[PDB]
Amino acid sequence: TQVEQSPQSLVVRQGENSVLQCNYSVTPDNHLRWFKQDTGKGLVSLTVLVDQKDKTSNGRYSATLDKDAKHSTLHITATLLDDTATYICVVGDRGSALGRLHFGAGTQLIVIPDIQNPDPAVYQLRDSKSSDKSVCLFTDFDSQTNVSQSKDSDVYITDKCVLDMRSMDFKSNSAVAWSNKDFACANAFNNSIIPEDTFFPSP
Amino acid sequence: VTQSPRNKVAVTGGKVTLSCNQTNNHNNMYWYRQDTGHGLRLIHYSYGAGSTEKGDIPDGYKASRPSQENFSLILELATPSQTSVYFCASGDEQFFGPGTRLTVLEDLKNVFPPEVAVFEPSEAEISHTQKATLVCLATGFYPDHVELSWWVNGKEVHSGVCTDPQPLKEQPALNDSRYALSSRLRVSATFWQNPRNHFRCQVQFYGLSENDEWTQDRAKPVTQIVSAEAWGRAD
Amino acid sequence: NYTFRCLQMSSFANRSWSRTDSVVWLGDLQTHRWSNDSATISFTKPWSQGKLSNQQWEKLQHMFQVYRVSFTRDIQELVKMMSPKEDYPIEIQLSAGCEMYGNASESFLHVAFQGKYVVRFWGTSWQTVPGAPSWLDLPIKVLNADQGTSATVQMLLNDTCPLFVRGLLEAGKSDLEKQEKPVAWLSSVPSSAHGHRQLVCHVSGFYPKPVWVMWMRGDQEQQGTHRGDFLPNADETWYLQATLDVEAGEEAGLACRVKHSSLGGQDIILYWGSLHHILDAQKMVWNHRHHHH
Amino acid sequence: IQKTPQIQVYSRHPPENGKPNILNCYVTQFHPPHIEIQMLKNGKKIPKVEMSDMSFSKDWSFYILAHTEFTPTETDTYACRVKHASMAEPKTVYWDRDM
Ligand SMILES: CCCCC/C=C/C/C=C\CCCCCCCCCC(=O)N[C@@H](CO[C@H]1O[C@H](CO)[C@H](O)[C@H](O)[C@H]1O)[C@H](O)[C@H](O)CCCCCCCCCCCCCC
Ligand SMILES: *[C@@H]1O[C@H](CO)[C@@H](O[C@@H]2O[C@H](CO)[C@@H](O)[C@H](O)[C@H]2NC(C)=O)[C@H](O)[C@H]1NC(C)=O
């Protein structure tokens, strides 16, 4: 391919600096552009680089281009949660309507929330209509914890997901698990490595 | 730069049009497709009203530009390989549309709507955090064209909500496994304890339409909204 | 007065087939060839690099390398833009140079479409020449949008063309000032008119180009003398014939008088009917087919 | 529109029977540039024929100089055959040393 990006995925702690690279072989190289693609939407232009050695800056985003190196770098200073998106490097061969853009495969940026006070716990939630159907909620753990999937074909464990309580500036991790089956809510996330002080209320 | 449809489930050998409409007075318009591991690739493009030109991979695709405003991608005979996310673009700097998620299937026999259930917060959590989490579980759907939305009292909320980035396969061993998706809304304990407070979990499922024939003993798995709901508990 | 010219010819037969060929002339000596079959500008003289360094030459060669592949693909796309309007086969010609004068010059870039001169680069942009087809207005508007190309074209026309040529004129001083001596012979042919003969005075193998040739009776130059075109020779010399129409009988007493720089006063005088003209003519006899009828 | 090639055949040195020489074939005033140009000895083509790079003049018409080494005689005939899209059949111009 003509436009190569690194890395595949980048995971940074919230409020830190993230760096993204782009390397191209496109001849000629009129301009370069970084796009931001939210998960489930279109590409939005962040910045352009036109000169032989250019350096642009918009908000927390700032970019640099070296056409002799055939290379570009995107910086996000003080990464926010809402920066979790795919970042696409695009080089455009001509500087007119007769040009043809070349798209890089993209870089997926994942921003992990700084959980100030971790209160790890696994709760059990019952169906709004029935007694029998329940789930397991693993919540309030820090971002250091990774949630491994099911070794069982009947148990369903989801990947961790961050929620933000806007008016209280509270962010929290959570995984959800359930099973049609001896399935206790305590030993549900047993394929993952849980913190000691995790709260396991009796059912 | 609008795109319709936003979602589409198609059969093998079925005729599918993806429209694209823009009101910017641009002469040039493009049709790309996105596939994991690649980055956008050019299908058909136009230099104006009545122009259509082949891109890097025009095979199985036809284009039309009836006016300056519109530019459609027509798939006469559909392939499973043509399952992709399609982006439209205009401009001389290009401007990109919202995207179209298109799934093309061999048979529609395995197409199912989601089963939706809300799970009420646990006392233990309420007592320990003074916050209440509600879990929604949309289950048993195929294919993975779902749009989940939480509704409190009649207005959709984004604050406190988080949904899974991807659905998980209920039977991962099978190539045509059904999917499940979970989402959570978290509120303050006192907010959950008000019995006047209403909660709804809305799952828009994109499935079959009228022009698609149905024969099976189950109900025709059309595009539909499936909703589970809960009310607040004083207790 | 010296004119430096880069002549380019591009042929577009259809949607995919194309070739671009270019030659480079200073005055009337070919310095550079660049055939579509090669991806390198070739010197045709040991001094074709002018007064440029290797690193200076590579940058300029690469500039054009990018140009060739870009030009082709641009025209192709413009054809697609005027899909129903213009169609293949399309012939494009670029004549681009600068003429030298006390350290002063004037540059030019002329473009032709289907053998007709339609566009030039004037100042900062492309321009449709008065008498151009009105369909060209859009493609010009498309090309002028390119700030990058405009910048590079201006640098070449304003600054690079004159800077380079000055180098070629000092590097090629020796060759451009060379002197080659012309040789002459005589012959005759039937005139278009009944009872008339056309005499031919062949002058060949001379350099430089300017040359004086006349049929005469002693001191009187025959006014009927017609100059032919200048015809090339592989060794970069020249062939020129001066003819005279005469009524069979006026032939004797005439002479062909050739003046050239490389002679330095000692003019060639061929006399019609001299022991030398006679000896030459019997050395060139033939069956006379298929003569020009 | 479409210009017709003019063919001029002439010799580098005075035509002197039985003396090695160069025969020039100079084609001008033609458009488009695609052209097949052949030189012949007695109808059969000459394999060793060199050719200059093509160029155009002030009127935008093309021109190219074909040349070959040859020995002129009283009987051996020399010609220049040109194939161009402006002509139905190829044009053959025989060498005339008197012209
Ligand atoms: C000194 C001895 C020279 C020896 C070699 C001889 C050559 C003879 C042939 C041509 C001589 C003429 C010189 C042409 C001028 C060269 C312009 C150079 C600029 C160029 O490469 N420009 C390129 C690349 O540019 C790209 O990349 C650039 C960076 O590489 C920039 O980033 C640009 O922004 C980007 O767009 C652009 O693609 C231009 O469009 C090239 C085309 C210009 C030719 C003019 C077209 C004729 C008009 C008629 C049209 C009618 C059509 C109707 C159907
Ligand atoms: C190259 O030289 C030309 C003039 O020889 C310049 O063209 C002029 O540019 C100025 C400002 O850009 C305009 O106001 C004039 O109208 C232009 N003149 C003509 C005759 O069109 C050009 O600026 C020079 N470019 C460089 C890079 O030196």
Side-chain angles (χ1 to χ4, degrees), chain A residues 1-3 5-8 10-12 14-40 42-54 56-67 69-128 130 132 134-143 145-150 152 154-179 182-193 195 197-203, chain B residues 1-5 7-14 16-18 20-51 53 55-61 63 65-66 68 70-71 73-76 78-105 108 110-122 124-154 156-168 170-195 197-209 212 214-216 219 221-235, chain C residues 1-14 16-17 19-40 42-44 46-50 52-54 56-58 60-82 84 87-98 100-137 139-140 142-146 148-154 156-162 164-165 167-169 171-172 174-175 179-180 182-191 193-208 210-219 221-246 248-265 267-268 270-274 276-277 279-282 284-288 290-291, chain D residues 2-18 20-28 30-34 37-43 46-47 49 51-57 59-68 70-80 82 84-88 90-98:
Chain A
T1 329
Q2 283 174 40
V3 190
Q5 289 181 251
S6 59
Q8 199 92 314
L10 182 70
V11 202
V12 289
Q14 193 202 39
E16 290 183 344
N17 292 25
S18 40
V19 220
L20 313 171
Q21 322 285 311
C22 176
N23 293 290
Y24 58 85
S25 64
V26 175
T27 302
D29 33 286
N30 173 258
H31 61 235
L32 191 135
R33 194 176 290 268
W34 288 93
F35 280 96
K36 178 167 186 280
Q37 207 206 346
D38 285 302
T39 61
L43 284 75
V44 177
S45 184
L46 297 181
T47 194
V48 219
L49 294 135
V50 185
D51 293 30
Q52 195 76 16
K53 277 182 168 65
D54 212 342
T56 178
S57 193
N58 191 7
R60 303 186 317 277
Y61 313 115
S62 68
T64 60
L65 167 66
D66 190 4
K67 282 180 175 179
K70 297 230 178 185
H71 170 267
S72 173
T73 310
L74 184 52
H75 302 260
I76 304 158
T77 301
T79 329
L80 297 176
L81 265 188
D82 303 302
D83 286 352
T84 305
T86 311
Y87 291 83
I88 297 156
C89 183
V90 174
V91 186
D93 51 41
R94 310 267 191 278
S96 59
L98 309 166
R100 198 90 91 262
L101 300 184
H102 303 94
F103 301 75
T107 296
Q108 191 177 301
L109 183 75
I110 309 159
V111 187
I112 43 168
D114 188 48
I115 304 298
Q116 206 78 202
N117 296 295
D119 196 9
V122 180
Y123 304 107
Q124 194 197 146
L125 292 71
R126 301 211 164 272
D127 200 333
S128 178
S130 70
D132 44 17
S134 85
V135 288
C136 292
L137 181 84
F138 184 33
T139 190
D140 304 333
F141 54 101
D142 75 356
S143 303
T145 306
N146 282 299
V147 187
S148 301
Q149 308 297 280
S150 185
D152 198 306
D154 285 324
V155 188
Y156 314 109
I157 301 173
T158 64
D159 201 314
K160 55 175 178 161
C161 174
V162 187
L163 71 86
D164 193 26
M165 302 190 69
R166 286 169 188 167
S167 72
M168 283 202 287
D169 195 37
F170 183 80
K171 295 152 181 65
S172 70
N173 294 314
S174 71
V176 176
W178 72 96
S179 178
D182 68 316
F183 177 70
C185 217
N187 294 335
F189 297 87
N190 75 112
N191 308 126
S192 314
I193 277 84
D197 71 88
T198 318
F199 181 43
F200 294 101
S202 296
Chain B
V1 192
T2 332
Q3 275 187 242
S4 69
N7 294 254
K8 194 76 171 78
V9 183
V11 217
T12 308
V16 167
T17 307
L18 306 174
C20 178
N21 186 237
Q22 49 84 31
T23 54
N24 306 77
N25 208 30
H26 288 134
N27 284 351
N28 297 343
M29 287 186 76
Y30 305 79
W31 265 114
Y32 304 89
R33 95 173 229 191
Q34 200 173 33
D35 295 289
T36 39
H38 278 84
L40 278 66
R41 282 182 290 168
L42 187 65
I43 293 164
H44 290 299
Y45 67 98
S46 180
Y47 279 115
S51 174
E53 306 289 342
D56 292 27
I57 44 157
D59 279 33
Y61 303 99
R65 186 145 182 191
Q68 176 94 331
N70 278 82
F71 182 51
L73 183 63
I74 315 162
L75 294 64
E76 304 281 22
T79 343
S81 64
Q82 291 178 329
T83 294
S84 195
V85 189
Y86 295 91
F87 295 100
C88 183
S90 89
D92 299 53
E93 181 198 19
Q94 292 188 32
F95 287 83
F96 294 77
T100 296
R101 219 175 177 278
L102 170 67
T103 307
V104 183
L105 300 163
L108 300 170
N110 305 120
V111 175
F112 285 99
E115 309 258 320
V116 189
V118 172
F119 292 79
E120 298 178 68
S122 70
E125 190 216 2
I126 290 159
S127 315
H128 183 54
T129 65
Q130 303 303 292
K131 294 176 292 287
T133 319
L134 293 74
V135 173
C136 194
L137 223 73
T139 60
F141 59 93
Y142 192 94
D144 67 326
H145 282 247
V146 289
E147 291 173 331
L148 201 151
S149 56
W150 284 97
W151 293 77
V152 178
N153 282 340
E156 181 190 346
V157 291
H158 298 110
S159 181
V161 173
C162 108
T163 310
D164 289 328
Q166 59 181 73
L168 88 168
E170 288 174 354
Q171 304 227 347
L174 318 169
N175 293 329
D176 59 332
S177 177
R178 299 208 216 155
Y179 294 96
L181 189 87
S182 68
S183 171
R184 32 280 210 207
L185 164 67
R186 197 173 195 181
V187 287
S188 70
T190 59
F191 188 82
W192 162 254
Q193 286 159 339
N194 178 20
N197 278 334
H198 171 86
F199 309 89
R200 189 160 70 103
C201 182
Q202 181 163 294
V203 178
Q204 174 77 244
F205 172 71
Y206 290 98
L208 271 62
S209 289
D212 311 342
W214 192 255
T215 49
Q216 294 305 308
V222 294
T223 301
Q224 58 172 115
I225 290 169
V226 192
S227 271
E229 61 147 61
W231 290 86
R233 286 181 305 194
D235 260 329
Chain C
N1 283 298
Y2 274 96
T3 314
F4 173 80
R5 16 188 41 121
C6 300
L7 307 178
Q8 180 187 256
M9 64 272 291
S10 290
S11 304
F12 297 98
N14 44 53
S16 62
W17 194 96
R19 72 172 295 157
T20 287
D21 290 307
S22 311
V23 288
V24 177
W25 301 85
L26 172 66
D28 55 20
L29 301 169
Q30 199 187 329
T31 56
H32 308 86
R33 66 156 55 93
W34 191 25
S35 187
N36 193 71
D37 309 308
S38 182
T40 312
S42 320
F43 316 115
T44 57
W47 44 267
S48 289
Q49 204 176 212
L52 295 186
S53 82
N54 284 34
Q56 280 194 147
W57 173 248
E58 301 310 323
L60 191 75
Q61 182 167 98
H62 175 254
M63 201 281 305
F64 278 109
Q65 277 170 339
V66 175
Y67 162 68
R68 197 170 79 174
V69 193
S70 304
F71 173 72
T72 318
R73 207 199 85 178
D74 273 39
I75 300 301
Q76 293 174 348
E77 296 299 299
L78 289 165
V79 177
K80 286 170 185 164
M81 213 178 87
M82 322 270 79
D87 60 332
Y88 303 106
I90 294 167
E91 299 290 353
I92 296 186
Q93 285 151 285
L94 267 79
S95 179
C98 49
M100 303 302 289
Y101 301 88
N103 201 9
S105 54
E106 200 195 306
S107 300
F108 58 94
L109 208 156
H110 301 314
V111 185
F113 180 87
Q114 306 291 50
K116 189 186 191 67
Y117 169 60
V118 290
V119 170
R120 37 89 98 105
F121 192 87
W122 196 233
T124 51
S125 53
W126 301 98
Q127 273 204 12
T128 71
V129 182
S134 71
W135 66 262
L136 271 163
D137 295 337
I140 288 310
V142 179
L143 296 158
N144 285 340
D146 193 349
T149 293
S150 171
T152 308
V153 171
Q154 283 174 65
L156 289 158
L157 295 179
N158 285 359
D159 299 320
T160 312
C161 196
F164 182 57
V165 184
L168 281 175
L169 285 162
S174 179
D175 261 329
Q179 293 289 332
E180 292 302 314
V183 183
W185 66 94
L186 297 179
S187 60
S188 68
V189 128
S191 161
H194 173 92
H196 287 67
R197 294 288 294 188
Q198 197 192 15
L199 307 171
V200 186
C201 184
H202 311 244
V203 190
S204 193
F206 62 95
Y207 185 88
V211 71
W212 185 89
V213 186
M214 273 289 209
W215 286 93
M216 299 189 66
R217 292 211 191 269
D219 61 356
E221 321 182 349
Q222 306 296 102
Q223 294 288 93
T225 310
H226 181 257
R227 260 187 154 201
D229 316 316
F230 288 90
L231 311 181
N233 285 325
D235 61 329
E236 312 195 56
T237 40
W238 295 92
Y239 174 90
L240 185 90
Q241 76 179 219
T243 71
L244 194 69
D245 183 277
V246 285
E250 300 165 352
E251 296 136 331
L254 284 174
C256 187
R257 198 164 191 95
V258 180
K259 288 180 199 202
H260 195 255
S261 62
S262 63
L263 305 161
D267 307 336
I268 296 152
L270 303 176
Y271 284 98
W272 185 269
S274 72
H276 184 269
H277 171 23
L279 284 168
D280 276 4
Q282 53 191 32
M284 45 182 281
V285 275
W286 65 303
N287 66 350
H288 275 74
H290 315 74
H291 68 283
Chain D
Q2 210 171 49
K3 305 298 185 72
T4 306
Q6 305 308 300
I7 315 157
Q8 289 162 303
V9 196
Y10 55 102
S11 65
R12 177 64 188 84
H13 300 285
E16 304 187 54
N17 294 303
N21 204 302
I22 294 160
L23 197 69
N24 297 338
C25 183
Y26 181 54
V27 196
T28 68
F30 64 95
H31 205 103
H34 182 69
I37 297 161
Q38 287 183 34
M39 294 187 75
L40 322 153
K41 201 173 102 158
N42 305 289
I46 304 164
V49 168
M51 216 151 298
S52 71
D53 305 313
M54 189 167 290
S55 175
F56 50 86
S57 51
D59 69 343
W60 298 108
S61 82
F62 293 95
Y63 73 80
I64 181 161
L65 179 88
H67 77 276
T68 177
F70 87 123
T71 295
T73 57
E74 300 192 51
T75 31
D76 288 298
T77 59
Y78 290 89
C80 201
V82 163
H84 192 256
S86 60
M87 263 134 41
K91 202 195 292 179
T92 306
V93 162
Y94 290 93
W95 177 47
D96 187 355
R97 66 181 75 174
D98 300 319

